[PDB]
Amino acid sequence: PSCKELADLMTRCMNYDPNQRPFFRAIMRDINKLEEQNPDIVTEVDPTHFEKRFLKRIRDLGEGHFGKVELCRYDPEGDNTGEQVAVKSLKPESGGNHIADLKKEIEILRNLYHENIVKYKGICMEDGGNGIKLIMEFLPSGSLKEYLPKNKNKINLKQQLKYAIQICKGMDYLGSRQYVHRDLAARNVLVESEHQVKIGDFGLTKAIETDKEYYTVKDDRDSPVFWYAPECLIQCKFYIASDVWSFGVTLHELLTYCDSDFSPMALFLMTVTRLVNTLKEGKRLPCPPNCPDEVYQLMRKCWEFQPSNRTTFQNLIEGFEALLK
Ligand SMILES: Nc1ncnc2c1ncn2[C@@H]1O[C@H](COP(=O)(O)OP(=O)(O)O)[C@@H](O)[C@H]1O
Structure with missing residues (x-):
């Protein structure tokens, strides 16, 4: 509040130690005293903001096509202890336009809440207006x-089934509010401790409209070559079920333990024309070696190029839980 005496009472009542809150009779006594004591009838501590001056570097790890990620510790105290954080930041190299996309990415992560998504921790900036730095939790x-x-x-096949199951709920949550992640792969999907996986960044997130079930792309050079729905080249339109193929490829890699050369880009043997002709001719990739029959038999349906033939994530989790049971 704006009155010195009342703030004291509110602070005493709203203590974080449940055994230090005062008794109610003391509250009544203090209120009664305050009433007669003051005949007068009449900077913020927002933790979501960080300052670069108190950020201490330790080591660098991770990189992307639109920024860099580093590990840092925030400690305005005597630097004895603090909290380890991951600081999504841009780089001066050709950073003439990263500001708008970074702001939009900050906007998205402030309006989401699910267990299978990396937590948002705050924001940071400098005096120049640019240099905005996202700060989010760190996964060891x-x-x-x-x-x-x-x-x-x-690891065991049980945990593999669990991991394949869990990310589907996050993807369904994302698709619920009409968002398309546009890029799903192992490098983006994170894992914390065990039996928990949280989706990573959302840099290329775009939102479709109710009157148009597809998005418009002006430049397709940014997208990876072999996580590419056929409509992305045939019509340059992005549909929600496009990432279903991406999830299937991710599932295949998940069963593959991220082998040296079994990745589809390494497994596949003029790239755009070859991809288009193979997609039209149905030259799909075969099953993984030593793979159990039922899981890839189920996965084969979602790999179908037709968006209509692709199933919802709810149906996929239903099938996976049926197989697990
Ligand atoms: N919260 C986090 N904790 C630990 N490591 C992270 C975190 N977020 C991202 N990383 C690291 O970033 C790498 C993935 O790069 P990423 O930042 O997803 O690329 P891009 O910037 O293109 O999205 C991973 O190797 C991962 O170790």
């Missing part, structure tokens, strides 16, 4: 691509 285990090779033998 990194992404799945960096985890499965490290524990290929220790």
Whole structure:
């Protein structure tokens, strides 16, 4: 509040230690005293903002096609202890337009809430208006691509089924509010501790309209070559079920433990023309080696090039839970 005496009472009542809050009779006594004591009838501590001056670097890890990510510790105290954070930031190299997309990305992560999504922690900026730096939580285990090779033998098919299941709920949550992530792969999907996976960044997020079930792209050079729905080249239109193919490829890699050369780009043997002709001719990739029959038999349906033949994520989790049971 704006009155010195009342703020004291509110602070005493609203203490974070439940055994230090005062008794109600003391509250009544203090209110009665305050009433007669003051005949007069009449800077913020917002934690979501960070300042670069108190950010301390430790090491660098991770990079992307639209920014860099580093590990830092925030400690305005005597630097004895603090909180380890991951700081999404741009780079001066050709950063003439990253500001708008970074602002939009900040906007998206402030309006989402689900368990299978990386938490938002705050924002940071400098005096120049540019230099905006997103700060989000840090996952010690990194992404799945960096985890499965490290524990290929220790892991089990049970946890593989669990991991394949969990990201589907996050994707369904994203599709609920009419968002398309436009890029899904192992490097983006994160894993924390065990049995928990949270989706990574949302840089290329765009929202479709009710009157048009597809988005418009002016330049397709940014998209990766072999995570590419056929409509993205045939008509340059982005549909929600486009990432279903992406999820199927991610599932295949998940069963593959991120092998050295079994990735479809490495597995495949003028790239655009070859891809188009193979898609029209149905030259789909075969099943993974040593793969159980039922899972890839189920996955084969979603790989179908027709968007209409693709199933909803709800149906996929239904099938997966039926198989698990
Ligand atoms: N919250 C986090 N905690 C730990 N590592 C992270 C976090 N977010 C991203 N990374 C690291 O970033 C790498 C993935 O790069 P990413 O930032 O997704 O590229 P892009 O910027 O193109 O999205 C991974 O190797 C992962 O270790």
